[PDB]
Structure 1
């Protein structure tokens, strides 16, 4: 069985037999900005070209219906647009007006009522197309998920004693000098199970306590923080000894959410720990040192761990043995 989430945060999941694809067009905006730049840069170019054409032919049709084509050199009659020499000239005008470059070689004149209301309709719809594409671009340029790129998770998780309690720990970092606002950490245990009743539940999610009851899950994340899950009665890890752990088949998905200081927008950084990435009996190497009026983070030690003396017993047995020690 392969992991549900990769160490970089992408999920190993494919959505198949989605029969209502009608839905992807119902929010087209979302499908567009979700697309790869290649697809956006293409569509943008296509959308622009078809608008110039679709109006360039309408500019040519009205030019043909009015009878401007017939005489192209007479004093008395003036066409809707001066200088429209053929099949392509209307295309340049259609651009001069929608991009509003309007070189003024191709100029509108009074003769057709049909012309004025078109230039109007164009300019109006010329704003609606241009906006949509710019809008679409800005969003895609400014989307938060990119910030996740500079949010890092320690490569392993560790289990070791902390003031009498066995803790599952992982370390988290923000590489930017800016802040993740309303930052918070949650974590899900993913492992298959079967209920007494027989129901096999493929990749069952159960939330792991990492501060939610005390609000310690609400981070102030400048220098890297070790996030710590205390293995108590309620922990999924309560009955797991050093010796059992490798035989367990589970995955902890670790999820960091907050807002990009600059754009108020919320991002989500993810990582994952499969059973072979949890080191029993280890500790995270310090990364902080105080040099001349600033705290210096040595990211060379960010992922680094070291072994310490640690019980091999499950937290449950540790407790039981301690409660009897007290009780003697």
Structure 2
């Protein structure tokens, strides 16, 4: 139909109406979710932009903050573990054409491996998001950060779309429930070792 990006490099999608808020509310979604995408239990949250420092492109990374004990019995008050959101594939370099869905595919290398719908109610973690981007007006470096504690990760949810041939920024934070198995990915790989003829 029409391009998303002009040969100029000018982005063609227009926002909706933003309200009078001059506070940075549409940079990250308020909640994260965990549910199936492309056949993989995936931790998800949504990235937008900043109103007063609109960015072209950014690189994003995530850490997980949590207390743990080492096999040596050392207590690590707040330990930092990395959460792959696509460094090895370039998915962590964002082209901020529109609100993006950041995906942390939960696998064996993830700290959410043994995270299940039930284990969630006893876990205490905190996903920190660090985004460093390029203000389009100039090209200087700006950093925006956010946080999801366990009560702001919604197991079994999916984000509403926000796009039409137009970004409906009013649906930016909205999620809804989808059929999502309640077990961890460690459990699901265990069930398939088990159910393998």
TM-score, normalisation: structure 2: 0.82
* Alignment of 1:239 onto 2:118: no
Question: What is the DSSP-based 3-state SS (H/G/I as helix, E as strand, rest coil) of the residue aligned with 1:297?
Answer: coil
Contact 1:179-1:221 at 8 Å conserved across structures: no
Relative distance call for 1:150 and 1:308 in structure 2 (3 A) is: closer
Query: Which structure carries more relative contact order (alpha carbon 8 Å, separation 6+)?
Result: 2
Relative distance call for 1:151 and 1:307 in structure 2 (3 A) is: closer
- Deviation of 1:149 (Å): 3.5
* Alignment of 1:302 onto 2:172: yes
* Alignment of 1:229 onto 2:104: yes
Which structure: larger Rg? 1
Cα RMSD over matched residues?
A: 2.1
What pairs with 1:252-263 in structure 2 (closer than 5 Å)? 252-263=127-138
**Greater mean deviation of Cα atoms: 191-200 or 170-179:** 170-179
Q: Tell me what 1:125 maps to.
A: none
For residues 156 and 177 of structure 2, the distance between their equivalents in structure 1, rounded to whole angstroms, comes to 6
Aligned equivalent of 1:213, options 88, 99, 105: 88
Question: What is the DSSP-based 3-state SS (H/G/I as helix, E as strand, rest coil) of the residue aligned with 1:288?
Answer: coil
List structure 1 runs of 4+ shifted beyond 6 angstroms. Answer: none
Map Cα deviations across residues 160-195 of structure 1 (whole Å, 9 max, x no partner): 011221000000102559852441110000001121
Q: Tell me what 1:171 maps to.
A: 46
Higher share in strand: 2
Q: Tell me what 2:183 maps to.
A: 313
Q: Tell me what 1:180 maps to.
A: 55
Contact 1:181-1:259 at 8 Å conserved across structures: yes
Structure 1 unaligned residues grouped into runs of 5+: 1-146, 291-295
For residues 194 and 69 of structure 2, the distance between their equivalents in structure 1, rounded to whole angstroms, comes to 33
For residues 165 and 314 of structure 1, the distance between their equivalents in structure 2, rounded to whole angstroms, comes to 11
Relative distance call for 1:148 and 1:211 in structure 2 (3 A) is: farther
What is the aligned length? Answer: 176
TM-score, normalisation: structure 1: 0.51
- Deviation of 1:148 (Å): 9.3
Contact 2:59-2:132 at 8 Å conserved across structures: yes
Higher share in helix: 1
For residues 38 and 89 of structure 2, the distance between their equivalents in structure 1, rounded to whole angstroms, comes to 18
